[PDB]
């Protein structure tokens, strides 16, 4: 405590009551003649100290601060996730014990926990003397941590797994588990530091915290400074401390970087930082000016921020961050490195799926990072080749058990916002659709969670290209017959993509007879055109209900009439039974006392806009105003502000 | 049994983990099925504009193909937690709300 | 099992847990690895000297006389050569070595001149002492003391005690090693293993022990493994000499040439008994719980979330007042205690003293709000109450209490806390120093620890005051001169130069560090960790609802925040801790109150609860009581209240 070493590289005096040795050292560093009044031994010691201090980024004293800008730089292959490089490095023969330590850490990071435990035991056996006790201590700690992680994997893999993951999938043998339990029958890590030689305890005091259950309480408590609402800043201090912790944990090859506490700390820090930045932007806009500040948030997002968010965040956490901390106004920094990282992720996914060498332990760690990175890649502008590789890896080789068809469509639609569809991506999606069509040839059906299916891919293709025709799908449906019903249904879902001759040949396999046929066909297939005969069928249904005078049928035709999809005066002869139909058919004479505002929660953008364009507008505005005044409902206010104002 | 009941006001629905022994109209009987509602206001559409929520029916864990949806025979409601009868609460909650499907099992927000 | 065996096992387990266990290893353990025995070397010496051996005539004296005669006649080089020929072999380690090391012994003293116990020592660091110059050059504080001269420096006969001449001049040749071994025996708990009851070394040890007094030394344990069961008279005679014998033949049946599992039965029983809390009846439950709870009777209130540290992660103590089994494998002692509490008919099955202990435990658990188990919990209703005058701000009453004459040390503690709360930091510091001075004679020591921590915090407050005062620039007040006369400031600085708050807890007695484990967090920010994390999580959940317009219809999640808030406030304000003046605590309370108020305002204006459900249930209510007003007043700034009013 003789000095305070600030996170920006400055040193100040705190409790030094004796000689200011550090100031003299800096004075020697700056000068050159003063440097030369030392002996040879002292000169080489000074050179080594200078190299170490420059490597660890200690710049100067507080008084002599000049042009202080800090940039982080982590030099670990494990952080950047260059899996093939570490795989190659593991094979090569080691020279010293430090290479063995690094190999053990890389093996642990690659999911080969048994080999890593064995290598740690070997390092423990070999290294016991005499000044490298740091390696021995770190090896003990890492071995204990790997034992803990193996026990927890066993715990959440005997239960909540097995077929629910796909197969019993015993990660490790039972002989290894028995040996592990026997070797650590009563191991205690709390006394590990106190058993070391007294010279190790005196010298390497700063490593004591590695033997504790928790070591991040100081930073988590300090994170409260980002919630102050009172008008270097705390943002820079917190970010630099976070980078320091990450660099220390990753460059020294410590296995604590894979526990829940560290992930929670990272999530809390990043979320609070982004919240503070957004709040400051909002306050500045409120007081200073509408656009004087520029409306650009000051939180520049770089490559390391993207990597941390991808690695340590779940999907729900990213969703919360998006909802509360609007990101589209946050501009990303280095894009080439981010693109290379995403391309590497895609290539690793391709290798893992294709080679069939799935590592069950490594899969659980890797798939969450892959999913988070692909979800967050929406805000990054990607080149054509990287986008093509990412789309290929996501659509084809991504495991189905973790991304069903609907989630894959959601990811794909996200990826197209800032990049749009070039020809190659459309070709890839067409190939995927062709593969799915061939797969439908059976006891097979698509399973989705969000309710989105293969139709949406063709819908998106048509949205980005109105004049696209799938030649392969046309050839598939030209050879189609009447035996395989599900193939006809699937091609019906992709009706507009097929060619005209294919369309005409396909129509032969399904025709509409009754009102059920009409509603079903327009519901799933495409009967966009309203022929007069279909209209007559609807009129027959309405007459049947009229003379006969409960789910929803009539409101659908009322809305279709209001949207001018049906043009006829017979609709006015069916006024009185269903109030919604009367409202959508006859607005001028409709009794608005029967109107209920909940109907406004079931209409899309186009229908709401068309309603706003019809004059009915003032009564709806009054109803929405009363609803907002009575109960503070966000949906009603959003609708009223977006469409009726 | 009512502690897990949730009200979603963005689509005017209720989330409750129950099973429906619905009887489809015209004597068709269904075992313990349920519903799933998804809220999507940005879907690309054609003439089927009158929708922001898509409703799927799940029976025995498999999606039921819809041909003529007119089931109005209610259902013997079974709380799958410990097999409670909650039919009366269901019928009340349904009459209280003008929405087509008043009770679902899980809601997905695609916003 | 026999009662005495159970008592011995319990004592050994307790000593091992405390880290005061030392293992005395004999030669049978090395024999289990088929290492050459001394009688074979005696036979070889007899063959080389006389020509033919004789099995019948080999007494205890002969085993020492024959090698001495061989050394005297043949010389020295032959002795070393024969030792090299017979002892250079290498043998694998024994499972007994691993079982011994698995008991976590502080020291291992062995009369073996081998390396098996060294080779088997897995990943443990022991400083090996096998000569005289190695006693001073020890690197660590854990000793592997090879009494009889290991072969590390060579295979000569001068580095080991084998012959009769070496045995005779052992005290003169090895004073340091003998003194160190005697000190270790006198201090720690000694367990012998692999020794025959008639061995020379044990006889010498008992001869030395007989000189000591009748109270000073503990009775060493002795694990005896011989084919025949021990006799009554021999056991009584050796127990009168200071040994407590645990016989292995009476623990497991075996044939006469069985040695490996004879050792293994006792060793495995000892290893397994470490986690086994020996409890079978309700009296044992009451005694164990009282033993683990009674030290906390000094503290007025204990926050529930910390109880999981008291019971070594055996039970989850939730804030709402319930208890859950988490990692218990024993006879569910808390469940049995609750069953005794609920039914008064079984309360007559305990003795009088244990009945009074149960009454005290029931009162203590009732005071802290711990009600019952998880599933049995019904309509638990919880109230809040703080019994500190400082919290309510009744300044005149605290001044009157300061003026009134104190009769004990707790009154002095409370007076110091009130003085600190009143801004009289000089007098409070002096009174805290007086409390530390007069706390030499005590029974628990918690007051001393808390007073030292409070004094250090007051030091920080004074220093930061001085800083802000002089820095601000005399704008407030005339000269902005605190009552801090430079003499006083100076004295404080001199008295607090070397005080290190990190090593305060480590320097406390062992009993304090074993009983008051929870207090360790009071010296840093760790005690605010377990709450803060949770709070953040809950925030990210609660707002996640408010964006989706989702209205729950049961118990909200803000109850956890409110209960943890009140637990922390009560614990800090009722034990008179100065940590209530920190910035971090104020920020924590501010965030908790802001979240609660935002959630209440969101839930106030519902949409469809009245139209429908309201016939069945309507529990939505947040009442701003007196305590909420006090917390908002104390822990909030004007800007924060303005932001809350805007929202």
Numbering used by the authors:
A (entry chain A): 336 to 566, 578 to 787, 789 to 896, 909 to 974, 976 to 1005
B (entry chain E): 10 to 120
C (entry chain B): 22 to 142, 145 to 670
Provide the publication's sentences verbatim:
We therefore reconstituted the DSR2-DSAD1 binary complex and determined the cryo-EM structures at resolutions of 3.4–3.6 Å. DSAD1 is trapped by the tip of the CTD fishhook. Particularly, sheet-2 of DSAD1 packs above the H3 subdomain. The H4 subdomain, along with the H3 subdomain from the adjacent molecule, brackets the β-hairpin of DSAD1. Notably, Tyr16 of DSAD1 stacks against Tyr574 and Phe576 from the adjacent H3 subdomain. The interaction between DSR2 and DSAD1 was significantly compromised when mutating Tyr574 and Phe576 to glycine, indicating that the formation of DSR2 dimer appears to be important for DSAD1 binding. While the overall structure of the DSR2 molecule in the absence of DSAD1 is similar to that of the DSAD1-bound DSR2 molecule, subtle structural discrepancies are discerned within the H4 subdomain. The H4 subdomain moves outward by ~10 Å to accommodate DSAD1. The H4 subdomain seems to be critical for DSAD1 binding, as supported by the fact that the H4 subdomain and DSAD1 constitute the largest interface between DSR2 and DSAD1. Furthermore, DSAD1 was compromised in binding to DSR2 protein upon the removal of the H4 subdomain.
The defense-associated sirtuin 2 (DSR2) effector, a SIR2 domain-containing protein, protects bacteria from phage infection by depleting NAD+, while an anti-DSR2 protein (DSR anti-defense 1, DSAD1) is employed by some phages to evade this host defense. The NADase activity of DSR2 is unleashed by recognizing the phage tail tube protein (TTP). DSR2 is arranged as a dimer of dimers, which is facilitated by the tetramerization of SIR2 domains. DSR2 has a two-domain architecture, with the CTD responsible for sensing the infection signal and SIR2 acting to prevent phage propagation.
